[PDB]
Amino acid sequence: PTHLSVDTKFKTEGLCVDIPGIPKDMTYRRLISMMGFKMNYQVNGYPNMFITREEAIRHVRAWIGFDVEGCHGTNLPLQLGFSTGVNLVAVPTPLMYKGLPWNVVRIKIVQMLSDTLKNLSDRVVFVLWAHGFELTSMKYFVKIGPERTCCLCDRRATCFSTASDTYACWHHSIGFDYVYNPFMIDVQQWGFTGNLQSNHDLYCQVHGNAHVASCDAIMTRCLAVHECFVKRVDWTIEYPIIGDELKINAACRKVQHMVVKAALLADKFPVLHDIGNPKAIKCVPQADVEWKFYDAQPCSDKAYKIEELFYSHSDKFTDGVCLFWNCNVDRYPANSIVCRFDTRVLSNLNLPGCDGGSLYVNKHAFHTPAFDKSAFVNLKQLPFFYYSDSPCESHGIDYVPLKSATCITRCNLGGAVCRHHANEYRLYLDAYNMMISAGFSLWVYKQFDTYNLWNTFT
Ligand SMILES: C[n+]1cn([C@@H]2O[C@H](COP(=O)(O)OP(=O)(O)OP(=O)(O)OC[C@H]3O[C@@H](n4cnc5c(=O)[nH]c(N)nc54)[C@H](O)[C@@H]3O)[C@@H](O)[C@H]2O)c2nc(N)[nH]c(=O)c21
Ligand SMILES: [Zn+2]
Ligand SMILES: [Zn+2]
Ligand SMILES: [Zn+2]
């Protein structure tokens, strides 16, 4: 039950306009052969060009929307659209390219897919709203066969070159002309009513329809992300490490302990309303504050309404401070400590999402509602600072003397930062800059002032 059986039925009603007379009874085995490919009875790791809904979710980083529109069927040009926004015109002789024969179009496709996916996934999953021409055009730039490894490394092969008769992954595909062993999935097979635009526009207002192939490719992938990461959520699926996931997660927990501990020392809140992950633990377990938890799973569609979270416990969320660490609400109260992911940040962990949101894949997949500046009108941006009440003692690196107005320590209060707190300062600054560059923003109540922390050294 792992892979999609090649004898599974395939609904061809969406194909009968480009391909009139197509059989109603159709399997993937008869469809792959129809597309011009031969499986030759194979058990070499490539059982089907099409993958399941579950298998596609585990390879979401490889999703590339793909659509082909008749520009004017072997006798007419074809407009190739990809969710990267690229439009290629192939002739049988937001960016748009002029018409060119297939032998040079396939070279651009290998280059475009490789630069997109080399730091993301080991494969490519062509997300389709299939109507005919996109399946029949793959024979001009897709070659299938047994699973192979790269000729320059041990990654699996994703490209093939007719010049050298060799194979390569996304990293070493310069000069290659064919996509080797790709995967694909037809969203239209999931049982929708209506066309692509009517179904996409039910949940997203950001992607329009300029009647170009790439617009449909973007809407197709967007509709797929909504069905797999907005309407349905699966937090049990783990995703491989492809970047600084571990340092970013560790930096977020390092900053959270620093910020919440300092806010409790500076303002002496009697109560703390920790609103967010239902499995959360005290990030400052040594604090005197009364810690009250409120369960709320990460929202994947729209940001929570602060009215429905609070108003319907201590119930007096105006007492003490409220902690919204990656708990996206529409408008945070004035007595809040907030960590909110910026969906606009470009990174290999953050994928384009639905209706302004993004899909942040770090160990797990979190579809995050679109970043809204108006949510922080009652708060201010949290400035960088480093606080430490630990003993100014170095145990165990080369020391350039540290001078910083944001090093809240006894040694800095005394006019000279010690080597221990200087190491921890520069380590915390690296973690802070790691967290901010990853896309997380920090916000705090306007009364927060690091000048109140100097007095805890008395
Ligand atoms: C809720 N949320 C978080 N972020 C961010 O996304 C990343 C995923 O981290 P994560 O939540 O997968 O794990 P940690 O917090 O490191 O786990 P931890 O504190 O360790 O809690 C225990 C869990 O982690 C596991 N775990 C515990 N210790 C470790 C460890 O040392 N290493 C690893 N790899 N896992 C550990 C443990 O088995 C359990 O699954 C982080 O940057 C989050 O801030 C969000 N970002 C967006 N856009 N939207 C969200 O809704 C959102
Ligand atoms: Zn390679
Ligand atoms: Zn959309
Ligand atoms: Zn010190």
Numbering used by the authors: 24 to 95, 102 to 122, 151 to 369, 373 to 456, 463 to 524
From the paper:
The SARS-CoV-2 NSP14 is a bifunctional protein containing an N-terminal DEDDh-type exoribonuclease (ExoN) domain and a C-terminal SAM-dependent guanine-N7 methyltransferase (N7-MTase) domain. The ExoN domain is thought to play a role in RNA proofreading and maintaining the integrity of the viral genome by removal of mismatched nucleotides in a metal ion dependent manner. This exonuclease activity is greatly enhanced by the interaction of NSP14 with its activator protein NSP10. The NSP14 N7-MTase domain is located in the C-terminus of NSP14 (residues 288–527) and contributes an important methylation step in the formation of the viral 5′ RNA cap, which is essential for hijacking host translational machinery and suppressing innate immune responses.
